[PDB]
Structure formats: C-alpha cells, structure tokens
Design an enzyme around this catalytic site. Sequence first.
Site, PDB file in Angstrom:
ATOM      1  N   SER A  49      72.691  44.378 144.712  1.00 27.35           N
ATOM      2  CA  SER A  49      71.541  43.482 144.442  1.00 27.35           C
ATOM      3  C   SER A  49      70.382  44.284 143.798  1.00 27.35           C
ATOM      4  O   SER A  49      69.498  43.636 143.187  1.00 27.35           O
ATOM      5  CB  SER A  49      71.167  42.664 145.693  1.00 27.35           C
ATOM      6  OG  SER A  49      72.300  41.886 146.212  1.00 27.35           O
ATOM      7  N   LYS A  52      69.613  43.330 140.185  1.00 21.52           N
ATOM      8  CA  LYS A  52      68.809  42.154 139.879  1.00 21.52           C
ATOM      9  C   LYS A  52      67.575  42.533 139.050  1.00 21.52           C
ATOM     10  O   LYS A  52      67.091  41.700 138.272  1.00 21.52           O
ATOM     11  CB  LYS A  52      68.449  41.379 141.154  1.00 21.52           C
ATOM     12  CG  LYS A  52      69.529  40.408 141.616  1.00 21.52           C
ATOM     13  CD  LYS A  52      69.459  39.974 143.053  1.00 21.52           C
ATOM     14  CE  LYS A  52      70.567  38.991 143.350  1.00 21.52           C
ATOM     15  NZ  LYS A  52      71.729  39.606 143.981  1.00 21.52           N
ATOM     16  N   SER A  97      67.724  37.738 147.304  1.00 25.41           N
ATOM     17  CA  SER A  97      68.961  38.329 146.723  1.00 25.41           C
ATOM     18  C   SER A  97      69.990  37.214 146.515  1.00 25.41           C
ATOM     19  O   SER A  97      71.102  37.304 147.074  1.00 25.41           O
ATOM     20  CB  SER A  97      69.551  39.389 147.610  1.00 25.41           C
ATOM     21  OG  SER A  97      68.690  40.483 147.755  1.00 25.41           O
ATOM     22  N   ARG A 229      66.886  50.468 156.065  1.00 27.21           N
ATOM     23  CA  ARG A 229      66.594  50.832 154.648  1.00 27.21           C
ATOM     24  C   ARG A 229      65.091  51.046 154.478  1.00 27.21           C
ATOM     25  O   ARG A 229      64.675  52.149 154.072  1.00 27.21           O
ATOM     26  CB  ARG A 229      67.116  49.755 153.700  1.00 27.21           C
ATOM     27  CG  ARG A 229      68.628  49.644 153.739  1.00 27.21           C
ATOM     28  CD  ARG A 229      69.077  48.466 152.912  1.00 27.21           C
ATOM     29  NE  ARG A 229      68.673  47.194 153.491  1.00 27.21           N
ATOM     30  CZ  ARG A 229      68.905  46.036 152.931  1.00 27.21           C
ATOM     31  NH1 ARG A 229      69.520  45.969 151.769  1.00 27.21           N
ATOM     32  NH2 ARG A 229      68.505  44.936 153.527  1.00 27.21           N
TER      33      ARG A 229
END
Lengths: 244, 244
Positions: A49, A52, A97, A229
């Site tokens: 993702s 993107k 996403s 993350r």
Amino acid sequence: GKEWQENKSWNAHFTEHKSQGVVVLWNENKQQGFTNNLKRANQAFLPASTFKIPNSLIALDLGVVKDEHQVFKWDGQTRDIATWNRDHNLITAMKYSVVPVYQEFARQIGEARMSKMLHAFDYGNEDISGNVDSFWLDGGIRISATEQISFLRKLYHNKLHVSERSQRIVKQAMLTEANGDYIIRAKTGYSTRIEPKIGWWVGWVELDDNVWFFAMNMDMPTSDGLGLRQAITKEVLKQEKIIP
Amino acid sequence: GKEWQENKSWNAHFTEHKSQGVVVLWNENKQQGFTNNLKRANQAFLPASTFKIPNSLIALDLGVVKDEHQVFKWDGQTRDIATWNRDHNLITAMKYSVVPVYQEFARQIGEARMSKMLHAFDYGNEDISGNVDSFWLDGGIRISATEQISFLRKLYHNKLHVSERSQRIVKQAMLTEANGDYIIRAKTGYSTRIEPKIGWWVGWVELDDNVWFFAMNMDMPTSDGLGLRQAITKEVLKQEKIIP
Ligand SMILES: *C(=O)[C@H]([C@@H](C)O)[C@H]1C[C@@H](SCC/N=C/N)C(C(=O)O)=N1
Ligand SMILES: [Br-]
Ligand SMILES: [Br-]
C-alpha cells in the site's frame, strides 16, 4: 560525519516490542542519513500500500483522478476491511488503503504508461511484471527503505516528472498527523502475498526549520502488530529529539 | 432544514472560562448553520491576523510570494514576540502571525490591487481605508463570524477569483491539527489597536464524509486568555459530536 551512519541503540525499540526491522531517517538540512541496520535499510521488498503514493501521482497526472473530491463508488463486493465497503475519494482511499479503488486506477493507467512513469520516478527496481492491477502486491516491483527516501525527497521538492498540482494533491492526501510541533505526511503498507510478511511506514516529519524523511519496515507475521509500525518509528523520532 | 439556529447551551463553555463571545458552525453537507448568539454572529470586527488568509492568497496570486519555501528575512528590529525576530517562509509566518512579513506583502500588493481583490472575494465590508500596511489592524476593514464562513467556503471549493495553486498553498499554510478522526485548517487573530479587544479563530474541520466550517470571536482584554479561542471552540465541536 559521513552520508550514512548506523545507530544500533534503536534496536532496543524493536527488542522492547519483540520485533525485527529497520528505521531509516534523513535529515534534509544536513544531507545525512541514520539507520539501526545499514543492510536491512537496503533490502528491497514489495511496496504494497506504499505504492499508493506513486499510483496517486500517475492517476492525477493522466486525469484518471480529476481531484481529491471525485468519488470512486464501492463495486458492492463485501471485503474483510469494513472501511473498503463504501464510496471513497483520494483522501479516504489513501487514509484507509482502499486497494480496490487503486486496482481500478492501475487498470485505467495501463502497463505501458505505469512503466514509463516508474522509470521517470526512478522508483525501486522499476519492474511492473505481474498483473497491472496487483504487481505492487505479488508482481515484480521491489523497493528498499533508502529507495523510498530517495523517491519521497523528489516528491517533497516537487521534482518528479508530473505536474506541481499532482504532487501537491498527493502530499495533501498523505497528511496523517499535525500539531504545533510537527506535521507527518506518510503512507502505511502490509505485504502478505510473498515472504517475508512486512509492515511499511514511509514519509516525512515537517518542522519549522527542517524536514526529517523516514522509511521503516518490520516483520509482520500477523496483523496484531501493525500499530508497531508507527509506535517504533515514533520511539526513534523521540530518542533523536525530532518530536517531543 | 432551517438555515441558522441558536444554541444557547454553548454559553456554558464561555461562562466556565469567565468569557463572552460567539462560535458559528456550518455543516456543509446539510447547508445548516449553528451559533450560541445570532446577533454577535453577524457583528463585524477588525479581522486582525485572520486577514493573513486573503493577504496570503493575493501575495501568491500576484507573485509577491513565489511559494511556501521562499524566505522573508527578519528586518533586524527586535519586536515583543520572540518568534518574529527571525527569518520566515509562508508556513512559519502564518503559524506565528508574523505581522511585519505581511505588512511587507501589503506594501508590494498596493491599495489599488488590494481593493479590487477584497471586492472580488466579497470580503467583509471590502473597506481598506487606513494604512495599506495596517488597515486589517486599525483601519476600515470589518468582517463578522458568518462573513468569515462565507469566505472560507469559497476557499475550500477553490472558488475565489485567484489561481487554484494560490488556494492550495494557503489551505496548506492553514494546517493546524490532524489525526485519524479529523483535520483542522484555521487562522488565529488578536485585535488590540481598536476597542473592544477580541480574539478570532476561523477555519474548518475536515471529516471523512463532511466539512464543518467555524468562526469564533471572544472578548480578549489581556493576552492571558488567547488559548481559550481553541479550547472553547473544541468544547463546542465535542458537544456537537463533530470531533471525539
Ligand atoms: C497494503 O499494503 C495493504 C493491502 C496489500 O492489503 C492494505 C491493508 C491495510 S492493513 C489494515 C488492517 N486493519 C484493518 N482494519 C494496509 C496498511 O496498513 O497500509 N494496507
Ligand atoms: Br496540505
Ligand atoms: Br494546483
């Protein structure tokens, strides 16, 4: 000092969370990079993702997407992420996403133009082999944390071979956090189709007087850890005093 | 579907802080406004540093400002606000209400063009009488909370008679707060040169599916209370469930 410098003390942040991976920082003012692991920093994975970002740029520049308000109607197929089963614009699609929206973009972009554009952007291995609508999930494209930073730096300075407008709209869509201390523009990713399964977070921290670019990935066996993350990146940013 | 609606319960938020003023909300989706005080909502005051929004737009559109990175060098005169005695770009100048930078903009814009532009924008009473470089602080310009929302709605939709680029750059410069629930683009103001002394906060909250425009002003006898502009607005936004 040098262009790149290993700071292994950040590994205590991965250890704390029973995790493995890399954070890469780039101080724009000083033109100096920092990472906990120079080897992993240059290991290429599926963008997932995080693709993107360039996908958005190419879609806007070719008029597949007219602006950040244009509505992409849910195709009516229930998928396992609730937030995907609804209409979206560029802001909500990037925020959540929404893969299906971007697969539709990719199909209209088409492989010839997707390819030219990834070469123009110098994006990772520049390889779109696979399905034009899934190559960033299980096709040939690969990119390292340090290749993410190179790309993001061109975006920040409006240097990519697309219109200034396309770059501003995507930078707008990347907005994730802001307060009186900093702004974060970033994109998450979770690569699961090819091993190893990794989580991505790539973008930058704007301050009054400097920009700090960042790209991190980490082993993501299950989705239980996806919040690490940001949490681990933010522990590094705080240790370096880039944010309070 | 009544167009404006008085909600006097918001007064408890001004009362708790021993304050007086108005908050005006506008739900873009429903085309419905809400305020604690319909009369004060339409009372015009000096825009003060809220004028930095139209000033920015006019400077960018005429090329007085090339972009948000261009540096405006401190003139070297120590002033009472520490953060003004330093170099600034459009982002930091807006963030820190750096009057001297905007006075310089106004001088290069000039009264003839400043005047055309405020008429084109339908901005408050459209009156620039006073010093071309201080009229928004102690000259003839006056604007109400509801006139602020009208202007901001034109800015959001890129409808003002200036370039799309100028509007995007200013909307970028207005960024104040963002998280996964909402984005606030806004500008503060403190009018102190002409009585009564008031604090402003005008802008909007972006959600996934709606925009909530807002304009508040309040009596600001001393600067001790400037933080109440945001605190009281946020209590209203929370009461109306626009933010958690
Ligand atoms: C992109 O990398 C992912 C795609 C390949 O499936 C998507 C999936 C989300 S994970 C969100 C899980 N939580 C559900 N509510 C994602 C991301 O985190 O970036 N991108
Ligand atoms: Br923006
Ligand atoms: Br533009």
